[PDB]
Amino acid sequence: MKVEIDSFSGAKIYPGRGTLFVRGDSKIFRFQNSKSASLFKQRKNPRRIAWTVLFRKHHK
Amino acid sequence: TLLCCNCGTPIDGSTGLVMCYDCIKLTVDITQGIPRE
Amino acid sequence: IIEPSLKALASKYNCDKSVCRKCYARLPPRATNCRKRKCGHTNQLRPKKKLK
Amino acid sequence: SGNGAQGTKFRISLGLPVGAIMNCADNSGARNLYIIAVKGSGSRLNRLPAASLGDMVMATVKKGKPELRKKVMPAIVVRQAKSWRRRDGVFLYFEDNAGVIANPKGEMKGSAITGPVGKECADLWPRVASNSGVVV
Amino acid sequence: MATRTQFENSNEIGVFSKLTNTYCLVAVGGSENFYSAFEAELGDAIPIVHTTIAGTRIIGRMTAGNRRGLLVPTQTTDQELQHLRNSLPDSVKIQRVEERLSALGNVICCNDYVALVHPDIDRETEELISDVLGVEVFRQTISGNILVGSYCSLSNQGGLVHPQTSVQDQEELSSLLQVPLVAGTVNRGSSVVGAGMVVNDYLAVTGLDTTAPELSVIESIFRL
RNA sequence: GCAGUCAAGCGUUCAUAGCGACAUUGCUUUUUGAUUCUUCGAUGUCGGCUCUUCCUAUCAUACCGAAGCAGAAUUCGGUAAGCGUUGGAUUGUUCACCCACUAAUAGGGAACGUGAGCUGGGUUUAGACCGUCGUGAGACAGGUUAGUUUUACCCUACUGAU
């Protein structure tokens, strides 16, 4: 049993939960929930979304 | 530079082709399913 | 191995039979009528074809 | 299912029914595929049949190489956008419904497949797996 | 020599097997007939491993290996890695690559010395190929078909390509790989030779429809 | 439309493995014809959507029998109606034809099931156009186009509730 990480939020994803997405260039995206899933489809950048790990790590 | 892969001896072209012309003429048929009278 | 005696023994049960013309019921070779009600106990029988 | 299919596939959410137009992913010169019917389909009143990943369908070509089109041919899907579920619980979905031309025995027509391909089709049709570079 | 078999009812052996000069791989799908066709002409110096990487039976295309290394995709799990590591000699190093082209056996046509490879592979992946397998790489194509490990079967003794390969292409590739080639087919016209069969130094395995005209070429090109 | 008896004769020579004369008896109302018996101080008249049930003269499925039934594949036949019997192009269409899947894409009935259940494409009012007929008004079961589809709160039935 292995655990994954969301590509948008950097949340640990346990087995059973969330969708996955394979883009035309084959780069694969995992989404812990519809929130990150839809913020990805709206072309938002995680570095501007306050509650994400990328934001919090750039802001230190 | 291939072999006829049915009989073997006919070295044919790589324009994109299959077993020897005699082999497709005698063995293979694509007009079945019709009466000739 | 064939054992033609056992072949003739086998023929007693699967080949040495008659068949009714109407109901297609198998019957003994020494029959006089068919033994099934729905046909009519018909005296119109025929033998089974073994060869050909 | 055994129109040259190796094993038995688990069930996948029926994404693309008849009337659907899915891209083509091979180098056969076809640029789309209009599904008309499905193999292994079930018959229920007013239920139009449907095709899932890995399934084999009957298709028509609507764009490309006019020696191909105006005739029916078998096709095999390799991507769908409807989110299905693998038995490890995860859901997944591509961004485009896409298929491939083939013969009724499972052999492909082209020589390579652009884009990714589903595990659930590659395990089932080996010739597809041979002509594929990316499997998920 | 060349045996003939079927995995379940398929005449495509390179899809479900991966044969090297020191180990072999098979898919767990029954058919003791299919397993005996490997166990028969082999010694216990070549260990066979029944595995299914990424929950798949398509191992020969999803892997590419040599006699000193094995490359596997990022989709196979630690359980499978460990069943491989506990069952394969320690003379090889296994590495779970982390790149896009998951079908390694279609994009790599490798042997002990040389490796044809797909063009668009990462430069940090080709260097890992050289590192692990201990091989020099070449990245062009077969004859326009960029799936080298599927449209070209290859050994150190011999090599085989598909029947669209120009003679200039054959001369060029035979010069680069330093092994003679020849452009035939297998399983009655199947251009996909890298998958329709599998070969070693002293062994080949094809499908039951691999006829004698094809077996003759297979036993002429690969024995030498 | 279906069945049974005579079956010339065709069916490698081998009257029923099978197909078919001459006829002959005779069935069903699921077909036309005929009657005018019921409705002319309202039985709402085509088809389709929906939904249920029944029949068997079985398309498939199950089990058997026979075949110029080696196997495979088919045909015929017996019980058998438990379960199922499609998606679509054109057409108002029933009917039909064609494409495709399918185990199969069998036939039929219930006031030619079913309009206070729907729809209203058609037929079947008045408007209007063409063609033919007619001196003319006007006719055509000929073609085309537009054209209001009502009520349940009662009794019973049914579904559920006291």
Ligand SMILES: [Zn+2]
């Ligand atoms: Zn030939």
Ligand SMILES: [Zn+2]
């Ligand atoms: Zn009888």
